[PDB]
């Protein structure tokens, strides 16, 4: 709620980024192989921005990616319902 | 609400576009470096259209980008709940 679904998104975005590099390293060609841009990629994913920078190529990397989508889009189906509520409320007054 | 969450999106989309060019200029390779296409890029971002044209490469450019996503997706989680309400209502009559 208040800042709860928020925190869960950040667990996802970290552990996601961390595991993406683990799964993708070893696949010849993967760009998703350093902890920085891995993190950026998990934001590119939770928010469905689909910029086209990074994406996974391994099976497990794609599973990790799907977990981020779900756990992100849901978080962000709620973080965005809450920033809308709080500031729109106080700012609407 | 009526046209309130709307206006906030436009503050975001401008100041976003303006800062993107500031952060990205100086990074060898960035395409996000003129105030026009910067603006278009912030729409590409607030609306999660992910066309793949522009995207940032600097750290700060990506932060700016994330601010647009949040403040945009939230605005557009409300601008789109309001155009749905007004015209669907009057048009539904």
């Amino acid at each position, epitope marked *: 709620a208040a800042g709860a679904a928020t925190v869960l998104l950040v667990i996802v975005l970290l552990a996601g980024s*961390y595991l993406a*590099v683990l799964a993708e*390293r070893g696949a*010849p*060609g*993967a760009q998703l*192989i350093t*902890y920085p841009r891995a993190l950026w990629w998990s934001v590119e994913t939770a928010t469905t921005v689909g910029y086209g920078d990074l994406y996974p190529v391994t099976l497990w990397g794609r599973l990790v990616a799907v977990v981020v989508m779900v756990a992100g889009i849901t978080s962000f189906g709620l973080v965005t319902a809450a920033l809308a509520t709080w500031f729109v409320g106080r700012e609407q007054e | 609400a009526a046209g309130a969450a709307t206006v906030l999106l436009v503050i975001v989309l401008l100041a976003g576009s303006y800062l993107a060019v500031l952060a990205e200029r100086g*990074a060898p390779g960035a395409q996000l470096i003129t105030y026009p296409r910067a603006l278009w890029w912030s729409v590409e971002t607030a609306t999660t259209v992910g066309y793949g044209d522009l995207y940032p*490469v600097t750290l700060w450019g990506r932060l700016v980008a994330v601010v647009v996503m949040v403040a945009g997706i939230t605005s557009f989680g409300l601008v789109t709940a309001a155009l749905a309400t007004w015209f669907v209502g009057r048009e539904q009559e």
Partner: antibody
Amino acid sequence: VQLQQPGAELVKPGASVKLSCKASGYTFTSDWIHWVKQRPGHGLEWIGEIIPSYGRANYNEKIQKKATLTADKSSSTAFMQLSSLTSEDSAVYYCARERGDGYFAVWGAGTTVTVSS
Amino acid sequence: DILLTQSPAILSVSPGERVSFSCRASQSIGTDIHWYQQRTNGSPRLLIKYASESISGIPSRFSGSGSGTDFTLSINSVESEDIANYYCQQSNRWPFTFGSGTKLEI
């Protein structure tokens, strides 16, 4: 001395050998340990990486996969086992500490391996 | 397996004059290049990271240039202590790769 590896080894041809890399300093969860091969008067051949904390290793696709990587999660020492060597396998062997950002911040002194009877 | 190609192989130069080793990749890698110096008998030593960023504890002579596929290690001046092999190494796509190496002769 950050990364620390022994000076020199000698291997009978066809036999095996283990290589050490005790690393004082930090021991981050996110650390990776790499191994680079330098044949005499050659460049740097990346052999393979290992993340000691979690435990997975990845070897060089393109070379004869002669080795396998291991670690000691609470001795801060990582290992590389080279099995059944020839004289093509005699070289200097560095270990490196990539932080997870994609460069070899820290280099061991290198272990010189000579495969002779 | 991204191919880094360091030309020229050897580099003649008079002391104090600017020198530039070119690295050139087999496809775009953005800025994920890093330069390593390695003198005789010694281990390699990180010089420039991410193609432009300096390393603390590195002389200001070493200047990182380049982006995309054309990369340029540069030394604004030269002195005798700079004789070594020099290596570029990309971290943009797995596996990490190295260049062929460039030696500096004075």
